[PDB]
């Protein structure tokens, strides 16, 4: 009596982005939310596409449980999904990796420190070294 | 004598009143229950129809 059933309302094709947009209306009694990955797979064999060219987000299990609503897109190919989707969705789905970024404060500090020096820091390092030498 | 102490001393009656402790009570229901209690006590359990309602009638 689980029977998670899925529906795609307001579906619009879109070769502008080589996608198909829709709102995901998932009816699921006696159950919590649908754990996006599982619903991505459900849409994957629903629309005859791989589990990689399918994305869902913006979900909201309505008040009182049961129904839930989100937004979903199905891309014509996995490559188009790779080259059109935001980075954070490509990180959620495991098809990309979180970029090794220093924190914003450190980046700004380093930017100002680079501001202090005109041109490359090659000459100034040796100049300062031989300066404190004497 | 005429006056039992220094007359103009501040906090006199407060100082010498007998400290009587609060009497412990059952919980008084609050919210909708309190309004229901008041409605029952006044308009379906009319106690003293004579004269006025006389809520809080002194015992004499």
């Amino acid at each position: 009596s689980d029977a998670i059933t899925i529906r795609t309302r307001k579906v619009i094709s879109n070769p502008l982005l080589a996608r198909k947009q829709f709102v995901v209306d998932v009816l699921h009694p006696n159950r919590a939310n649908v754990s996006k990955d599982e619903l991505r797979e459900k849409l994957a064999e629903a629309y005859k596409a791989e589990k990689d060219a399918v994305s869902v987000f913006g979900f909201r299990t309505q008040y009182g449980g049961g129904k839930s609503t989100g937004f979903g897109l199905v891309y014509n190919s996995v490559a188009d999904a790779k080259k059109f989707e935001p980075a954070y969705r490509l990180v959620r789905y495991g098809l990309a990796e979180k970029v090794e970024k220093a924190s914003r404060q450190q980046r700004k500090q380093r930017k100002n420190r680079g501001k202090k020096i005109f041109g490359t820091g090659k000459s100034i390092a040796k100049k300062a070294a031989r300066r404190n030498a004497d | 004598g005429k006056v039992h102490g220094s007359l103009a001393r501040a906090g006199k009656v407060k100082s010498q009143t007998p400290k009587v402790e609060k009497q412990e009570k059952p919980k008084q229901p609050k919210g909708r229950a309190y309004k229901r209690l008041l409605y029952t006590r006044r308009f379906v359990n009319v106690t003293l129809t004579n004269g006025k309602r006389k809520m809080n009638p002194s015992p004499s």
Partner: protein, 144 residues
Amino acid sequence: GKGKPRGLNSARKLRVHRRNNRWAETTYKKRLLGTAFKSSPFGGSSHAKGIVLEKIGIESKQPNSAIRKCVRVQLIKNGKKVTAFVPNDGCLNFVDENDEVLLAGFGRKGKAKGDIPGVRFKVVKVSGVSLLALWKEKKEKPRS
């Protein structure tokens, strides 16, 4: 018919007549002259802190025989000195000499209330803590 003109082109004298008559009120005159900022102990201020100079009690009027426990406070914002009232029963001892006290209005539009002569300000807080919390022993004076 009446004292005021009634013609369709008499807006000017009607307006200036009202404008000259408005000074007869007290609220309008105070608001426009701005006497509150210049003369009152507080300039349009509901509350003000001050320093207790000494600790006085003031006798009441004829029909009421008692001594209301006051306190002379020099205001910190400008330096004026005003008497103020310590409201409740055992609160005189709570406020000690030379501690910061937050005086408030006395509720009668800057005029003496009841039988207390020459006072126009309550006492709400002392040394950062409120008098009502001290009087019911909810908080205690920090004694700094």
